[PDB]
Structures are given as C-alpha cells and as structure tokens.
Design a protein around this nucleic acid. Sequence first.
DNA 1: GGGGTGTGGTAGC
DNA 2: ATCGCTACCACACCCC
Length: 439
Amino acid sequence: IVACDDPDFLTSYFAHSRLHHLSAWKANLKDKFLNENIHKYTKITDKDTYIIFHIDFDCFFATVAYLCRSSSFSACDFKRDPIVVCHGTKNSDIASCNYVARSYGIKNGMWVSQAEKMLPNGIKLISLPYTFEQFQLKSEAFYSTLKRLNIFNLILPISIDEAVCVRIIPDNIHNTNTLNARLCEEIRQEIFQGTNGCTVSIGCSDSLVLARLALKMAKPNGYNITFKSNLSEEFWSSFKLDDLPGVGHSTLSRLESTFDSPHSLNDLRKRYTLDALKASVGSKLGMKIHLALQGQDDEESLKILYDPKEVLQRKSLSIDINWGIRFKNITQVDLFIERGCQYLLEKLNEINKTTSQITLKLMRRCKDAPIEPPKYMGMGRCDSFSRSSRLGIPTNEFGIIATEMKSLYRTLGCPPMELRGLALQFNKLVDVGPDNNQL
DNA sequence: GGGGTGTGGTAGC
DNA sequence: ATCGCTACCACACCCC
Ligand SMILES: [Mg+2]
Ligand SMILES: [N+]
C-alpha cells in the first residue's frame, strides 16, 4: 500500500485506475493518428458519399480478462458464468461485465456488492482482475487489423476498443446491403482471428448517430445495417432515451419530466416539439437530439469527418485524483501538488508545448458527510471548487506553475483534512517553434 | 461584435 | 479494502 503522501502514489494509483488507462489510451491513439497522418490528407469532403462502420469490442475488459485469465480461473466459462472485472469485493466498481451477468440485471459501473444481490441463490459471481497490458495488446491487434483490411478511407479512434471507420463510395459504384453485410462479417471474423478470440459488433449506416444506434442494436457479437432510408417505428422503439449520444442521466431526467416519461426513442419522437426540446435540455443539445431523431448528424459531430486532424488535436492537459486523498496538513498538500505539476510538465514536454493558463479544482467533504465514506478511500459526498489563472507569458517552468497552483489552493481555503480530491489543469497550450527570440 | 469566468454534463470499461 | 480519469462542449453570467 502507498498512501497519498508517499512519493509513489501518483504512479501506483494510475497503474491501478482503469479510468486513467482509458483516457491515457485514448490520448495516445489521438497522438498516433496525427503522427501517422502528418502529411497524408485523408479527410472527408462535401464531394464524398460515405458509409460509417462503427466498431466496438463486446464487453471488452471482461472478454480480454477472461481470455488471459490466470490458472485459478481455468475452468471458468465465459458463456455460462456471470463474470465481472473489478479490483475488490465490496464497494468496488464493476468496470465490465459479460452478457451472462447482464442477463441478471448487472450493469457496468455497479459496485460488486450491488451486483451480487441480483444473482439467484447458487449462482456465483466470477470476479476477474484487470489485465491492462493485455487490454492494450488486444487493442493493437484491433487497429492493425482495421488498417490491414484496406477497406476504409478514414479510421477514427474513439477509445482503446472502439473506432469509427469511414468508407467513401464512388458514384460509379452502387453500394448494396449484401456488400455491407459482407464487409461486416469480414471485419468481425478478421478481428476475431487477430485478437485470438475477442468479438466486436458493428453498426453500419450513412450517419454517425445512426451507426452508433445500429451498433447498440447489433450487440452482442453481431452487426446491424440501418440506413436513413431504412428508418422505422420498429427501429426507434428498440432504444431507450439515454441510448442517444449525448443523453446521460441528467439529460434523461429532464427529458422524462418534460415529456411524460417516454420509454423509447419512438415515444419521444412522437411527443416532442423542437422548441420544447430546446427548452427542456438546452438549445444546442436540443437541436442535436432533434436531428438525431431524424437519423441525422449535427454540425458539431460532423467536424471529426471534415477536419479530423483538428478535432483530434489535444487542446488541454490535466490530472484528476479523487480517490485516496487523505492529507493531515498543508505541507503534504503542497508536496502532492508539486508532484502533480512535475507529472504534468513531463507530459507537457513530450508534446513540446507551453501553457498560458492553469486551473486547480478540488473536492471538499460536505459538512454533514462522514469522514470515511462508504467506499474505502473514496471521495464520498463533496462540494467542488475551481479557480484558474492566466500566466501571461506561456511557460513550462516548474517554479512558476507549481507556485501558482499552490497559490490557487490557498485561494480556495479548503482545510487539508477536509480535502478529498484534486485536479490540476493546463487549459491553454502553446506551440514551441524554432524561433524563441523574444525580448 | 469581442472577451472573460466557474460550473456541469458526457464518454469510454 | 480499492485504485471515483480526463477532454471537450455548452451554459449562465460578467466586462468593455
Ligand atoms: Mg447516453
Ligand atoms: N463492458
């Protein structure tokens, strides 16, 4: 065990945090896309009629953790047993579960304790450990396979296990469902072979949003082709409201109240007016949902096809540590902030940039919340606080940045013992050019 | 028209 | 035990 005041805490937490892995993996995939395309210009123009293939592993962590399980899980059966991937036993997140487990109602993000309560007596939950390096290896096979197929004009990384693949269709070619289904089965089989046993599902359509919905329809271990001209009540009746891209629990609640608790996209589709939509959830999100309910992408979503080099360019840099934060005095808080800045400046130097504005955010124990929350080392119920500084001259100097960060902390007046989480951000990044002569 | 701030929601497993 | 990250958009509200 390494406590938050140990010099090794950042390294050990990040080594264990699957959420840190997700964001870090997505950041390298973006960087890699940019480097592989420094001189290629493989982007989508208005001249292009395109097909979107949205590809995603099925229960990625659970699958890979199963396939690479240790000897003590040899007789474990991925098709018959309910499997979760998780660190602990009680208030530990279920990062991923297999479709057996989901058939009992278990869902990603549940705590293990919760999921156990849903099995019938005699059914035992299998808990596999994370296999992070293997998660990465299987992801590499994924993207390598996607490129080797030579069937896509643009391959966009969404995550470690997810990509949006664009195929341009010449006007002198008449695309058919049968060609599409066959591409889908090629991709599925090749990736199965290439990952030594992982399965992906695929949504295939003439919009991002439709391909996203098709993909959830395809799961598990299948594919679905639904083009705009195929839309139907049966399609929209298949989806819950937060199946819409951009609709999370909070948008959901607003939508449910405004619209009499729709229970499907078909329900919502028949009940809404764009203007009451905008009123309920906001103008831009409201227009995005309205567009989506026609199978259509909005302008914001289209940018990634039109100028992917720009969309995928990293614009800010930060760390968030809201677990294991237990400091007894301000000297230990200041040292942790210094370690944090050191870590960020390393990342910032890899990408050869400076920062001109930084932010510190913190979580503070709510006055009525227990000192030790239900989740071991959790942040629990907190109030958040944030404050930022413009630096003026962009910099990568530890002295300037760490000093300002610590000052930003003092500004927020959170007693060390009340502190439960910290975020350190470089919000505005500045390129470093060969000319550094300034007076 | 331009700018700024802090806060909040979402996405991946 | 247990590892509740991180980038980005949007918004509400403030200024000249
Ligand atoms: Mg959603
Ligand atoms: N999963």
